[PDB]
Ligand binder design. Structure first.
Ligand SMILES: CN1CCN(C(=O)c2ccc3cc[nH]c3c2)CC1
Ligand code: NI
Length: 341
């Protein structure tokens, strides 16, 4: 059964609701982004209209084999009419193709669904600018003040400088970056760029990246592993055993591995600054966990909501426990009282 927080009232619409069979009364299914918790259920056999961004539509067609006749891509920042209701897609600052959705209900109510997002001040100058929003369906992933992390720019600076130092000291070092979904591409692209290398990867991962409309991508990625000194592997292989195994396969080209795991928040954010981060090392392998987030920090989320001043907030993450729900509700009230809405 489809949960209430995936339904848009006064419409025939659901958001990220593909794992519940045929949802009674749903005339159009929206998909915010191509992450598996959100697309779970879509396949070549899906025969209802799916509304999404162009990038998301490319991934549906080529990775899930959804038939073209049911994929309805919409341009960003453009008023569109869907089944008699005005909608707008906005960039979510999450992974490639991820959007927020504005719904203008026939009765005058305005609803913003953030999908997954990393709130940014730049959103305060989109089409949201002087738009009254009555209901906000909010990505509350990190809705607690302990969740701090650096800017994406600071984390990339650390990664570039770390990789460049290591490989300039040892030209026979290989760099490895973990991945398990789309998103966080800047990590491996920025490192390859500083090293003057293409990024080497599996055919399956290459296929995925070719769907993302990234400028000059043919110049940056390859399936020829032998030509590359930056390799991408599944996140599950980024451990001492898995990396030792990989090094064996490279045929004595390399004698050291520097590897990166781009996590979200971890407990070491409560203690350490990005400049001070150190790896776990065993012999000729080192592994850095770097806090590259594609979700709002607590402070970023707070600033967005206090700027927007919604009348009602509906959380879409951490909704399964009474303790989480009570904690989030207490922060929303704090934010409202501080800002005066
Ligand atoms: C930053 N943002 C906050 C929310 N917001 C309103 O609540 C609002 C109030 C009054 C009018 C009158 C026309 N449009 C309006 C929008 C728009 C500005
Ligand atoms: Ni996501």
């Amino acid at each position: 059964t489809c949960p209430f927080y995936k339904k848009i009232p006064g419409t025939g619409f659901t958001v990220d609701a593909f794992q519940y069979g045929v949802v009674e009364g749903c005339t159009a299914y929206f998909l915010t982004h191509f992450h598996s918790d959100h697309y779970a259920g879509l396949s070549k056999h899906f025969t209802f209209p799916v509304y999404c961004s162009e990038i998301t539509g490319n991934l549906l067609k080529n990775k899930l084999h959804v038939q073209e006749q049911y994929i309805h891509p919409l341009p960003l920042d453009t008023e569109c009419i869907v089944n008699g209701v005005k909608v707008v897609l906005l960039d979510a600052n999450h992974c490639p193709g991820a959007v927020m959705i504005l719904f203008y209900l026939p009765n005058g109510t305005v609803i913003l669904h953030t999908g997954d997002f990393r709130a940014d001040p730049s959103m305060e100058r989109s089409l949201l600018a002087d738009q009254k929003v009555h209901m906000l369906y909010l990505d509350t992933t990190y809705c607690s003040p302990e969740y701090t992390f650096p800017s994406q720019q600071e984390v990339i600076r650390f990664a570039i400088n770390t990789a460049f130092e290591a490989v300039t000291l040892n030209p026979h070092a290989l760099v490895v970056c973990g991945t398990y979904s789309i998103g966080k591409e800047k990590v491996f692209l920025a490192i390859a760029d500083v090293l003057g290398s293409k990024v080497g990867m599996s055919q399956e991962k290459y296929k995925t990246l070719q769907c993302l409309n990234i400028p000059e991508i043919n110049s940056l990625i390859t399936t020829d592993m032998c030509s590359s000194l930056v390799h991408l592997l599944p996140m599950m292989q980024i451990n001492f055993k898995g990396l030792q195994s990989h090094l064996k396969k490279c045929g004595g080209k390399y004698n050291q591995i520097l590897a990166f795991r781009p996590t979200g928040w971890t407990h070491s954010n409560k203690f350490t600054r990005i400049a001070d981060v150190i790896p776990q090392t065993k012999g000729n392998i080192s592994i850095y966990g770097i806090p590259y987030s594609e979700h709002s920090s607590y402070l970023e989320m707070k600033r967005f909501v206090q700027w927007l001043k919604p009348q009602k907030i509906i959380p879409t993450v951490n909704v399964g426990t009474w303790k989480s729900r009570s904690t989030m509700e207490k922060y929303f009230r704090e934010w409202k009282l501080e800002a005066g809405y």
